[PDB]
Design a protein around this ligand. Sequence first.
Ligand SMILES: Nc1nc2c([nH]c(=O)n2[C@H]2C[C@H](O)[C@@H](COP(=O)(O)OP(=O)(O)OP(=O)(O)O)O2)c(=O)[nH]1
Ligand SMILES: OC[C@H]1O[C@@](CO)(O[C@H]2O[C@H](CO)[C@@H](O)[C@H](O)[C@H]2O)[C@@H](O)[C@@H]1O
Ligand SMILES: [Mn+2]
Ligand code: NA
Length: 129
Amino acid sequence: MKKLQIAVGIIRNENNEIFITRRAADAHMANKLEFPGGKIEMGETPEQAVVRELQEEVGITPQHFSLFEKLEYEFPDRHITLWFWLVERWEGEPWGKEGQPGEWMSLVGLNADDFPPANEPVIAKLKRL
Ligand SMILES: Nc1nc2c([nH]c(=O)n2[C@H]2C[C@H](O)[C@@H](COP(=O)(O)OP(=O)(O)OP(=O)(O)O)O2)c(=O)[nH]1
Ligand SMILES: OC[C@H]1O[C@@](CO)(O[C@H]2O[C@H](CO)[C@@H](O)[C@H](O)[C@H]2O)[C@@H](O)[C@@H]1O
Ligand SMILES: [Mn+2]
Ligand code: NA
């Protein structure tokens, strides 16, 4: 199975809400809620990838962010390594820049069952902040 490195951004506003998008029906992890992000490309770093991915997907440039968690997860047909960056400062206003559903969701209300199973420990850890 293929192996992927994925960088994602946990976009947290001052009201303890996270900007969450919903994956397309024909995507891997179809219809799941997700932190915006995507594949780290050859020649770019995990830090550069989360910036580029958030610019492409939601129209913001994250800045002064931190690595919240890094973990590996084995899906039925692929192995991924996820870099979860906590993004508390950014330029712009996040939106569905690729036409995808996005909205702000209270951290306390997040349901890990709505996200890919790889996100379980991250969602739990976020709720302890
Ligand atoms: N974006 C994102 N992906 C996640 C999360 N949790 C999780 O297991 N994944 C998995 C689902 C996918 O297998 C992979 C993310 O790839 P992606 O489909 O977002 O990649 P991408 O935007 O670069 O896709 P592409 O169209 O550029 O090829 O990581 C998450 O919170 N956010
Ligand atoms: O790896 C993130 C980690 O590095 C620090 C500096 O110790 O921040 C640097 O890296 C971030 C990610 O590229 C930048 O956004 C930031 O501006 C830079 O100082 C820590 O703040 C952070 O935990
Ligand atoms: Mn993506
Ligand atoms: Na991508």
